[PDB]
A and B are shown apart, each in its own frame.
Chain A
Amino acid sequence: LLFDGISTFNVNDGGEMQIERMITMYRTNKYGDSDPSYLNVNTIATLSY
């Protein structure tokens, strides 16, 4: 799922839900090749800041 574009979550012991890795849907460039430039939500937030 992390390589598809869908973020994933981890369930802690006791039932609490946690964030594995929250990412955007950027997975390819304008070409067909893959692109990690906008992969992370942290990248978008940091660029906006």
Chain B
Amino acid sequence: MLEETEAALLARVRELFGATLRQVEPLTGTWTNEDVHRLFLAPPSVFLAWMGCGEGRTRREVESRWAFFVVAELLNGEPVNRPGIYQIVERLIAGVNGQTFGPTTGMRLTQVRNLCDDNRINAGVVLYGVLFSGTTPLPSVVDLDSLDDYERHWQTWKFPDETPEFAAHINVNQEK
């Protein structure tokens, strides 16, 4: 159950920040060196990206690694609202730490990378990026349901192929 966890994180971010963040949108792939010239950033906004999942404790759970890439504007080498972006980062860490989001539980902060190199400084964007790890379980085996009236029991004894056959066609629920 991963898409449900992703939707829960997005809903939590929307509820916590509201109109402070211009938009929120799951981001395909991790942040590469081309995403800045490819995405509809519309800063300030945050993108939730699934960075895979490492082995969990059991064979039914994994340690999913998510990431929150925060975006803003740095016109003239000056962040658009430095208190605003710092508050956004801290509040996103606080509201998405420990608290469960759907099946995933135990959201633990792992790192907060600055992730602001030339490709993003020259494009007027800061990219403070949070990372998370969570104990998310795997879906259960799909159940089944069917009712057929038991009426026949065909049993065949496994003699050699050309040995004369031996079998019983019980045909239960027969009365006489």
Any chain B CB within 8 A of the CB of A3?
no
Tally of contacts, chain A with chain B, CB under 8 A? 6
Q: Is the interface of B mostly helix, strand, loop or mixed?
A: loop
Any chain B CB within 8 A of the CB of A32?
yes
A30–B174 Cα gap in the complex (Å)?
8
Any chain B CB within 8 A of the CB of A31?
yes
Least CB distance, A28 to chain B, in whole angstroms: 9
Chain B residues 137 to 176 lying within 8 A of chain A, measured CB to CB, are 172, 174-176
Q: Which residues of B contact A30 (CB under 8 A)?
A: 175
Nearest A residue to B171 by beta-carbon distance?
A31
B interface residues, tally (CB under 8 Å): 4
- A 23-49 binary contact with B (CB < 8 Å = 1; else 0): 000000011100000000000000000
A12–B175 Cα gap in the complex (Å)?
42
Q: Which residues of A contact B176 (CB under 8 A)?
A: 31-32
- B 54-81 binary contact with A (CB < 8 Å = 1; else 0): 0000000000000000000000000000
Nearest A residue to B174 by beta-carbon distance?
A31
A32–B171 Cα gap in the complex (Å)?
12
Q: Which residues of B contact A32 (CB under 8 A)?
A: 176
Q: Which residues of A contact B174 (CB under 8 A)?
A: 31
A32–B175 Cα gap in the complex (Å)?
7
Least CB distance, B102 to chain A, in whole angstroms: 53
Q: Which residues of B contact A31 (CB under 8 A)?
A: 172, 174-176
Nearest B residue to A31 by beta-carbon distance?
B174
A48–B174 Cα gap in the complex (Å)?
28
Nearest A residue to B176 by beta-carbon distance?
A32
Least CB distance, B151 to chain A, in whole angstroms: 12
Least CB distance, A26 to chain B, in whole angstroms: 15
List 6 A-B pairs, minimum CB-CB distance, nearest first: A30-B175, A32-B176, A31-B174, A31-B175, A31-B176, A31-B172
